[PDB]
Amino acid sequence: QGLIQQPKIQSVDETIPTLCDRVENSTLISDRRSAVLGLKAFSRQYRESVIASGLKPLLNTLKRDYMDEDSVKAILETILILFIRGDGHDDLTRGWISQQSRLQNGKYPSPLVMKEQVDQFSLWIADALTQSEDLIHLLVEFWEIDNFHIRLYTIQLLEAVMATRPLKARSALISLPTSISTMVSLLDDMHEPIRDEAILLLMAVVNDSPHVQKLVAFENIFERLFSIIEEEGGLRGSLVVNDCLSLINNILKYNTSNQTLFLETGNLPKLAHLLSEPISQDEVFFWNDQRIVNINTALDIVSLTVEPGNTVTTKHQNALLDSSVLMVVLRLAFFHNIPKKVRPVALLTAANMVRSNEHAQLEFSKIDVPYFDPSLPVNSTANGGPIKLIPVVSILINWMLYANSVHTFDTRVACSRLLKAYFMDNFDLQRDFLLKQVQLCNNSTNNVGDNFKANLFEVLLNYDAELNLNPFKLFFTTDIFMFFFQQDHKYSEELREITRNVTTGNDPLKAIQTISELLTTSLTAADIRIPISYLTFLIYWLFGDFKATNDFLSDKSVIKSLLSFSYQIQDEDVTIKCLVTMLLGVAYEFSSKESPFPRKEYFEFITKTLGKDNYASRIKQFKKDSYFSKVDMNEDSILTPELDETGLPKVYFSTYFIQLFNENIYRIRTALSHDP
Template identity: 30%
Template sequence: MFSGILANQAPPKQTATATIATLCDRLAHATLLEDRRAAVLGLRSFARDYKESVASGGLRWLIVALDKDRDDVDTVKVVLETLLLLFANEHQNSDSPDDIALWLADEFTQKQANINLLIDLLDQTDFYDRLYALRILSAILKNRPERTRECIYTAPLGLERLVATLDDRREIIRNEGVQLLIALTDDHAEIQKLVAYNGAFDGVFNIIDLEGGITGGFLVQDCLRLLTNLLAFNVSNQSYFQEARCDTKLVQLLGNDKTDDMLLEATSKNLLQLLNLCKVFVTFVGSAAEAHQKYLWDCGLTPRVLALAFSPKSTIDVRAEALCTAADLIRGNHALQEKFALMQVDASTLPGFSVPDVPNEGPNRTAFVIEALLNMALLDINIASFNVRMAAVQCIEAYVHNNPETRLHFIDRAVKGFTSGEDETANIFNSLIELDSNSQSDPYKTWFSGAIFQTLIFENREAQDIAMNLTSGDAESGEEVVTAIQNFSSNLLEALQYGLNSRISLAFLMILCVWLNENPEAVNDFLMENSTLESLLALVNHINNEDAVLLQGVCTFLIGIVFEFSTKESPVPRVDLHSRILGRLKKDQYFLKLHKLRQHPAIRDFEEAGNRPHRKGLPEVYFTGDFIKFFKDNYSKNYYHFKERLDGSLSPLPGIISRSLDRDPGDQSGHHGNGEPHMVSEEMLQSVTAQLEIKEDEYSKLQAAHTALEHQLSQEQERFRSFKESSSSTVQKIKEVAAREIATAQDNAQAIQEESEANILAEREAARSEIQEVTLRMDAALRESRAATDKVTKETSVIIAKLQEHSAQLEKELGSLREGNSAQSQQLNAQAQQIDNMKSAILKLESQLNEQLDTAKKTQSRHESERDVERKARDVERKAAEKRLSDLKREMESRLQETARIAEDSAKKAATAEAEILKVKEAAKKEKAEMEMEREGEREKAAIAQAEADDLMLVMADLEENVKKYKARLKKLGEDVTDDEGEGEEEEEEEEEEED
């Protein structure tokens, strides 16, 4: 009955938005810590599903609570959990930023105090405070990196506290600290310096040791990434790293020979990151890089990297990266290049290696590193080893980089080894001079050989001359002697005619372009075979494979170079060469093929394509970096120059390849072997004369300006001398005035000193007289105090005698009181006897009452069955009434839920468009009227329930009347029923009914 009444009077169900607003208001104005904590707990329950409402209404007060209640661990934990839920992105794998997270990051970074508050939490020892603070800082940094970096950088002890998390004993906090520092130090030099100088290097290496070194998990990889961020492009950190002797720790990581699980994926990734870290020391070009190269070699890092590259335990990716790292560590350093060539490495990973039959011969076979690199690049035919082969070529390029003597020695030994046939190692000319059946299955053997040869002769005329001595065929035996250029040209035509892999053709084309550039002797050698140029011109327009654009473009580029550097001594005259080119290759086609080559992704996106993963089949690598640079540097200049050469319509532009100006195809002026013109035309002479006159005019103007400047300089010098003389006289006067002032000051000081000494003597005399007076006064006071002491002693003796008399009198009174107490004790004994008698009487009364109670119980047991029947009837009626009330309550709750759902739907519809506001209001009014009608119906039902309850009350009144009748009947039967017993039974029945 009462539950139904309360259900009717309950307020309508509150929405989530209103509840969040109430919780935010309570959090803002609550004065008790428990109330604020309860409000935050409520907001946390809504933070996942109602982020916008909680963030807009509660972020400010959450930050305030975090500051106000920072000493309460439980409250701080709940606040931080709520903030993390607000920052959480539902799509964790999505790279798109969350609008709510962006807004939260803006709110946090607008005030420096907010970031300081989170950083202060890192000083707490509580686990959740430190962990959640790091995660929130990471979320803010992810959404607003620049502003967050500045706030952390300017926060007091901000970076120091972040670095301190690396020393935390709890692993998860160390992990979060490493992740935050990685994001924080990315591309910010000042933060990198502060993080390094606050002990980050030691903290990172300690974590690596705890994780098991290079064989550790992903945390080791993150630590190495952090070190890379701190050292990359930061010379000061690199110097500090060396001063702290951290380089020895790098060597220890690379020299960990207990790694039998080197083939594990985690270990391979850690090694790749470690090798990438080693390369940051030699990123810069110049003396700093050379110093770092020497330092890393001396500490044993470079030899260890090279050993890792040839270790049989290393994976293919690790070997390739180790070779690239070794290349960077020796590139351009002559002393290290010489030491590098003398090193021996493990040959067990080389192609064709076989374990020796004799076990005592040694565990491993070794080879010199250059021989091993050539063997690896040219003899390994496995497609999966492409990265290792490419890295071996890069290592050879680094070995000869910026070292002409090494280049000449390398190519001379290769030429002699091929000519004699006694070279036991892999030779680059084996696949370049003679195309075998393996060239089609392994086109990169020829391509890598061409890449190495191109590196040796690139912009090195002496190396090109040595290669010119390479010939095939024995003239004494009647065989035709064929030069290397003619051999390469023949192989090129063969590869184009028979449709061999395009990489083979491109290898020969790159070599010929680099070799013939600015080398008329090489051009003449190329034109010695008249059919070579004709075949090349015939094939340019008939190449129809998937790499036709590349082949046609590079062939066209080669034809342009041949025409540009041909001379009057060339086997094909320039006029005939010009007509042949235009006869087979029209000028529009010529320029179009060059333009398509420049726009091809293999040329245009060469840097990006080198970092892409290779697809199935052969890698999409067609050119070397040197050739790409060579082509791009000459493309635009050659374009206009060649166009002017062919049709004479445009003015020539000066370029690297073009050596003569305003020269038509009929001009017979050519080039010497060094590429310089040996004849000067009349037009060129006039041009030079005009330029000389211009230079003379400029020189006269400069000379006049020089004279004017000398005159001005003399005037300034005169002014300076006059100023110097005037200033010297002024200084002399100042010195004299200063001397007089100093003398006056000394006299004054002496007078003041004499006066102060006289004052001190007078003060001493006065002090002596005062001390004498004080001494006399003290003696008089001492005599007076002694007289007063004697007087007090006499008075004290008198008082003691009086007290003794008073104590004797008190003892007499105490004796009389003891006699009175004995009489009172007798009276108390008599009273105790009376109390015992009363207790016995009470026991008798209790026994009589128990007997009467037993008789009442017997009487009650006789009529128990009748009362049980009546009670069961009342229970059945009560349960039926409760069932009706519960049904009414459920029906009312369902209708209230239905009305709440309708109200929410109407609110959503109202927010869609302003044009439907009136309709929605009308619908809301109608629904409200219906709700009122339903409430009236529910009130009527409640009235019915009230009427039923009144009927139950009437039934209870009838039962009470029946009880009174039963009492009267018992009295008539002769049973003793007291009024108290009846009242007790009535009270028990009333209590049972209330409990029901």
């Protein structure tokens, strides 16, 4: 309504104020209503004029005309228009409102949504609606009106104020009892867009609010959200499923009671059913960014319930084990048709499920995964069955060690973290694993050794000429053995001793001397990872282990090579040079009178050649001026690391080595000093 050229000065001074007057004062709803539509037209051009002039009248006429549907509807449209000037195509900025309820409160397909807008004018409207506890209560009462647009416009307006003044709006909404129950009931609304919009407002309201988390939980919401998810096609739903999952996430995050509620009320079978969607003989599940995000959000919900350090973790872990969830997430980890971004997430979810739980770990050790066909399989029974069952632990070790090219580094470190979750705080399972692993090595060195791969001893004690093409294979191997060797670990001595007393044939010969030969041979290797892995391993092994120091010292030829190697041009290989130096120092510190290279003989041999100053210097130089110096002191931020020209992660040091060095840096540096 109007014309094209209307000078601002007449509109502000004469028309809007007159219309504001008519909205509040006309004694005929008909003319009040009509004044609102007059304001609604000016709201597109003269937003702020109408906010200043129009707002209090609009809100006053809204409390008066609240039983009149056309009156309520026209005022709600007008406020929504006023909320933002806005770049986009909708004057009511409803797209912006939904996007704020998602981005502010959930994790959405980042690629698929590459998108301040809120003014002093927004905040004016937001405070006008917020100061008034009664206006909030009025809006809530509008959900009883039998009008689609009013119910939707009310949800949207509340989303707008929750995106601008959440604490006041959340405060007001809680004050009305019955308020949440009503919101949850919008999920049953006959009209789909009210159901959809209500998931977004629920996300906004329960976010960072334990009070609302418990309030929403008591409204039987899990049952509702899971029917919407199955009704929209599960993982193959798009945003509504993301919203449903995102809302399930916000109701459980940091709410143990809500978590134990979710598990005990028959949700697991539902979550399992949804997680299990991508695995069918029938179709080839179609993967895109939305379905990746849906499943990962689903996996995250499993993870929440079993966050380590909470008192309920064991309970939750045990609960998840008493369903199909573990088996289903391990299918997602191992199945062929699974995106790279999903595999690691499934692997670390399983790791949270089993970490430090005998019952979870002992069940884990019995899980087998179906595989298809070998060489020369006649499908007929007489030849056999083309299906083979492989133990999950074997696949982890295989993927960890030999799955370069086909699997991402992230999957390989997830495999490493799941294995550590499996062995965590379970000495018996650690011992049985190593003992089984040494048998298999003795078939590769004795029975058929001299006339798929999952053996750590094979890697640690054999020479691979092409190791430079898969350096991380060695890095993982040393990192698992250091993990086992932890001094602070219960009965680590037994595990050290089993690894020490292994004999081989390569390049009979015990583990520490075989690794020594492998080390010295490695000082000339393309990848500096290879030498760092052996060096840090042996330093770790020798540190506080007299029998390991004696095995090392029992071969003067190796100490000669290491001393020779330590003499390099001042800039050439300062990291190897210091690690070699550190090895000899540490070997000195746990040398005794009856070490095969006697202490005082080995002391003279090291001190005369290198010097008490040059040693201490090269320990100090290792901390401050080597590869070691620039490592982030993160226990679990080796996932998604920085890359090389070659394309290799910038990962050199196992965390156990870093912890050992940092915790005894003084003792290392002063090994040659003072001691006899």
